């Protein structure tokens, strides 16, 4: 009851993050970095996924918030080689590029040196590590292209 000293004992929503419904990019301060995308490029699908899991678990143990873990579209490139005593290119092998991205935020400037040192020391063979600041273009690169929108935009140009 309101007048009783036990008023408000049942309150619970002040302990819960307000969830009242794409995502705004939060730039970091002078001492903390903003949203960061940790790209993991490799020719082996297992290596890319396994290291992304390792990075995701590493951040949790380091109390670093992980915004989102997702996979970039697979790139398939044909590999052709020139035949001996010939001028014709013949297909040799097919290579698929797999990219895994782990999105983190709130990284401290002083702690960035330690975090980058640990991840680069554990990088598997054949895996490329690239850490970039999150931008709108990178997020928009995960969506299908819209030729119909482009065609209408060309008329306006």
């Amino acid at each position: 009851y309101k007048t009783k000293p036990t008023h408000g004992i049942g309150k619970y929503k002040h302990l819960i993050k307000a969830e009242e419904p794409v995502r705004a990019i939060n730039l970091g301060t002078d001492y903390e970095y903003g949203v960061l995308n940790i790209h993991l490029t490799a020719y082996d699908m297992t290596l890319a996924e396994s290291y992304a899991q390792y990075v995701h678990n590493l951040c949790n143990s380091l109390s670093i918030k992980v915004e989102e873990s997702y996979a970039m579209p697979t790139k398939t490139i044909e590999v052709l080689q020139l035949q001996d005593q010939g001028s014709k290119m013949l297909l040799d092998s097919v290579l698929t590029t797999h990219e895994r991205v782990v999105q983190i935020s709130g990284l401290s400037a002083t702690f960035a040196e330690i975090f980058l040192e640990i991840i680069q020391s554990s990088l598997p063979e054949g895996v490329r590590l690239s850490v970039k600041e999150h931008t709108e273009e990178d997020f928009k690169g995960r969506f299908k292209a819209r030729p119909e929108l482009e065609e209408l935009l060309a008329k306006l140009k």
């Binding site: 309101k2 000293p5 008023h7 302990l15 993050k17 109390s63 918030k65």
Partner: peptide, 29 residues
């Protein structure tokens, strides 16, 4: 009309400033 509580209210030790950084239960047990 209000009356102050006779003692420490529940969940008073919870720091609401760092609610995002606070560890959650995440489980029923």
């Amino acid at each position: 009309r209000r009356t102050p509580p006779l003692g420490p209210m529940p969940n008073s030790d919870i720091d609401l400033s760092n609610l995002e950084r606070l560890e959650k239960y995440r489980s029923f047990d």
